[PDB]
Amino acid sequence: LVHVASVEKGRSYEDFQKVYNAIALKLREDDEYDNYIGYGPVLVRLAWHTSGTWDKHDNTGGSYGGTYRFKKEFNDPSNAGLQNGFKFLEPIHKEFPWISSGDLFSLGGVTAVQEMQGPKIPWRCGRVDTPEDTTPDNGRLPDADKDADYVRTFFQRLNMNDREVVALMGAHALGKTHLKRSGYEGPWGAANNVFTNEFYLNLLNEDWKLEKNDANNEQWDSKSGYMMLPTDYSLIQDPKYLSIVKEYANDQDKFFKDFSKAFEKLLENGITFPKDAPSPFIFKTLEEQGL
Ligand code: HEM
């Protein structure tokens, strides 16, 4: 199965900047969500989970088909809570009904990262909705209770290497774990709706204790009130991951650049872009537009 990007008919960069802007303006307006964290983090997670079902071996799942809109995928236990991101995007989709679902879910993530002062993420259009029977089964998203070997093997299926994995995990600066959602509870840091390299700094610099939460799962906790999942902590237990964690803790610009590449790649896995497709778009933030 080849998925060829097909530009929404007649649309160009300005059309998608309008969608970006509507997302960004709602992000600003709907600021109460999740005890004033706002929707940025869950939109980033929605983009990742809608992309992260991909299997490089047969090109099943991935962002192209926008299959989260079907009940098998929106009810995946691994996706608990993402319905909030979907509901956020609904009025956006109503205003811009021409955008594909995959294009909107992925653009939500890009827009959230950038509006949270993260790196620019180049973004390409052209995902096309595919039918209900193309929805991937549950179970392709990762478990959090595992070690570095798990994480490394998991991400090979998404064609990600060690650097790409450690970079992508930096998104756990954002938002928080919610006990009723994942069986884990707590934020990873203080700046959880501003995109920074804090995840790496906290991994290295907090004093972590292995505790059980109220769902009887182990997680790493600090006196500052932060947490790390076992899979996060695995990034400092494994010496290869550890080196890269230290690199990003010590170079914010490097983290931004590597995150941007890896996140674009994640969002584009499975898609074939024709030779004459438009170049990737780099959207201006609201701030850059004076909006
Ligand atoms: C080994 C890989 C990963 C595991 C096991 C993992 C697991 C988790 C878990 C358990 C949660 C908490 C869900 C909740 O209770 O609300 C979470 C939240 C989140 N994850 Fe991941 N994650 C991984 C990779 C990633 C990647 C690659 C990204 C994106 C680049 C990402 C972005 C997020 C964000 C932004 C949140 C916060 C969501 C919110 O506040 O609503 N995660 N992750």
Side-chain angles (χ1 to χ4, degrees):
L1 53 199
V2 177
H3 290 321
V4 182
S6 190
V7 175
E8 292 85 339
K9 186 160 182 48
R11 300 285 167 185
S12 62
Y13 172 78
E14 162 214 274
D15 297 279
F16 296 100
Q17 179 78 70
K18 289 178 181 165
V19 178
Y20 177 106
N21 284 357
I23 296 164
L25 290 160
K26 192 183 177 53
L27 269 176
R28 179 193 280 175
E29 173 70 32
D30 289 3
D31 63 330
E32 64 297 313
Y33 174 70
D34 212 349
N35 289 297
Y36 283 89
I37 293 166
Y39 284 93
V42 75
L43 290 177
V44 174
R45 203 196 194 208
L46 180 65
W48 140 239
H49 270 206
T50 54
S51 303
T53 59
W54 187 59
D55 189 335
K56 68 181 177 181
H57 301 98
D58 59 7
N59 203 17
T60 53
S63 77
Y64 185 82
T67 50
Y68 179 85
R69 68 192 197 277
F70 296 117
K71 76 184 100 80
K72 177 172 76 177
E73 180 168 353
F74 64 64
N75 289 326
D76 183 351
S78 304
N79 285 338
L82 289 184
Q83 303 95 327
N84 291 282
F86 186 86
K87 282 222 206 220
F88 174 98
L89 293 173
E90 280 184 334
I92 310 295
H93 217 165
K94 191 177 175 164
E95 178 170 2
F96 303 96
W98 51 265
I99 193 168
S100 69
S101 285
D103 279 359
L104 183 59
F105 305 147
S106 62
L107 184 54
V110 168
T111 303
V113 168
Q114 298 194 176
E115 294 294 305
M116 291 192 290
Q117 293 177 335
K120 289 307 186 76
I121 317 293
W123 181 87
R124 302 183 86 160
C125 71
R127 299 165 188 77
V128 178
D129 293 1
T130 57
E132 193 153 16
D133 68 359
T134 65
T135 306
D137 290 341
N138 298 355
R140 294 172 173 224
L141 295 165
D143 298 334
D145 66 331
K146 305 288 205 284
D147 65 9
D149 295 332
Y150 173 82
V151 169
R152 180 167 288 114
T153 293
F154 173 84
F155 271 106
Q156 283 169 183
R157 198 200 70 225
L158 295 173
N159 191 35
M160 301 291 179
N161 70 12
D162 282 6
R163 289 182 64 89
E164 289 169 324
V165 166
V166 176
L168 286 167
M169 217 75 74
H172 279 176
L174 305 169
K176 67 188 291 291
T177 66
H178 311 77
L179 204 74
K180 283 210 228 201
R181 284 184 193 172
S182 63
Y184 298 97
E185 168 70 33
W188 292 269
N192 65 162
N193 58 18
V194 177
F195 198 97
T196 74
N197 66 159
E198 192 180 357
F199 170 83
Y200 311 102
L201 289 157
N202 288 355
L203 268 173
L204 295 173
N205 297 148
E206 295 288 301
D207 297 332
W208 301 107
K209 289 206 166 192
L210 181 63
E211 295 180 336
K212 271 197 166 165
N213 67 33
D214 289 353
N216 201 217
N217 301 314
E218 291 192 314
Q219 54 179 71
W220 293 92
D221 296 331
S222 78
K223 311 165 240 282
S224 312
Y226 314 147
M227 63 85 67
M228 297 278 157
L229 301 158
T231 43
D232 297 318
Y233 199 80
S234 86
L235 301 189
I236 59 172
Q237 297 172 314
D238 178 277
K240 303 188 201 93
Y241 282 157
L242 175 62
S243 294
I244 305 163
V245 169
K246 291 176 182 174
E247 298 183 31
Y248 293 147
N250 286 282
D251 190 336
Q252 296 173 105
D253 182 60
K254 183 62 171 152
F255 168 53
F256 270 34
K257 288 183 313 165
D258 285 356
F259 182 87
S260 175
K261 297 194 278 178
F263 194 62
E264 178 176 13
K265 174 175 167 177
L266 177 77
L267 273 47
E268 290 172 3
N269 296 132
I271 308 172
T272 299
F273 295 93
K275 121 208 240 260
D276 57 346
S279 300
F281 302 134
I282 302 173
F283 299 116
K284 307 297 197 282
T285 62
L286 295 180
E287 184 168 71
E288 280 171 335
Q289 294 171 90
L291 298 171

